[PDB]
């Protein structure tokens with residue numbers, strides 16, 4: 195059954211933290227950027243410095259979202275708003291795009307050091323879904339999704355991709371809007387009531403629920419009950435610590 199109802203004919207996976215062991219790299223890059231930006235703010239304004247919490251702040255405000263939505267959402271949680279700027283703003287600019295580019299510069303530095311690794315259980319699950327003849331899409335906010343799927347070889351399991359480039363070029367609202375999962379379902383030729391969503395991000399689980407997908411599977415690798423509770427509260431039908439728990 196692969197943990198799925200019989201009506202499910204396709205699986206939609208997030209990338210970082212679901213298929214590849216790359217969520218900690220993104221989290222490190224987000225925290226390092228935001229700590230430096232917030233400390234630089236405190237130097238300018240005299241406001242109290244409060245670091246970026248790589249658990250609660252990442253999971254609530256950043257995880258899964260379009261990069262610039264993650265910037266705006268975390269900043270808003272601190273009662274900070276800055277101009278959006280332009281997509282090619284340098285990382286030194288105090289704009290939403292600038293901070294996103296600053297984080298992306300960080301991420302690429304970390305990624306070139308230690309390349310993306312696949313979770314063994316995720317490889318097993320993709321092999322099982324593929325052997326069962328189910329469609330597979332990857333739906334991620336990360337702009338590097340195509341490259342990650344290529345270097346890991348996971349692209350051999352994936353028929354459709356909606357990633358950070360797709361969101362920008364097709365003007366698709368990111369998670370927690372359901373729109374990017376619905377675009378992937380459409381590319382796969384299935385309706386949401388015939389599709390399963392696999393997500394480690396609270397925003398992504400909420401997107402799956404908002405899209406009325408047949409099953410929303412949350413992934414909790416934190417080892418803490420609190421994130422599993424949040425995944426269920428945000429709309430996950432199933433929570434696993436690893437996809438192999440469904441085999």
Ligand SMILES: [Cl-]
Pocket residue numbers: 261298335336337338358
């Ligand atoms: Cl990105």
Ligand SMILES: [Cl-]
Pocket residue numbers: 431432433434
């Ligand atoms: Cl469960």
